[PDB]
Design a protein around this ligand. Structure first.
Ligand SMILES: CCCCCCCCCCCCCCCCCCCCCC[C@@H](C)CCCCCCCCCCCCCCCCCCC
Ligand SMILES: [Cl-]
Length: 117
């Protein structure tokens, strides 16, 4: 498991805020974590919200590739560059939908390392 244990407490406050803002349930997060994605704002806006909180996306859901790469371990760098080559730029009807399309692309491209917290 590539995910380090330190991340969980780091994101806790923002996670709670994002869920509350968007009406997100833990069940929805569990679902997307297992790779099942639907275009429901309560989960897609949650994903945008959490990325935004950690400066991974801007005000139009453009991904900051440098920041993203900086967060990922060494063994995932080339794979991420490859996945980002495929999945960026983001597109969609709004910020949450951009993130839905991105999540679908990333999950399909790298299912074995996919996760959502
Ligand atoms: C091939 C690699 C795929 C990457 C796995 C797919 C999901 C990864 C989610 C992105 C999180 C990146 C870092 C997560 C662990 C970092 C640990 C470092 C701790 C120090 C800082 C902690 C915070 C910066 C954590 C930030 C948490 C943000 C989670 C966002 C959840 C929504 C993800 C779904 C959207 C897919 C975007 C995906 C955008 C990336 C493009 C392709 C690699
Ligand atoms: Cl982008």
């Amino acid at each position: 498991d590539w995910v380090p244990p330190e991340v969980f407490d780091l994101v806790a406050e923002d996670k709670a805020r994002c869920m509350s803002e968007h009406g997100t349930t833990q069940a929805q997060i569990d679902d997307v974590d297992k790779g099942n994605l639907v275009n429901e704002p309560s989960i897609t806006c949650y994903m945008y919200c959490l990325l935004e909180a950690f400066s991974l996306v801007d005000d139009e859901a453009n991904v900051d590739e440098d920041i993203m790469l900086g967060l990922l371990p060494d063994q995932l760098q080339e794979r991420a560059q490859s996945v980002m080559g495929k999945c960026l730029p983001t597109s969609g009807s709004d910020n949450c939908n951009k993130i839905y399309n991105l999540a679908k692309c990333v999950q399909e491209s790298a299912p074995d390392v996919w996760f959502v917290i």
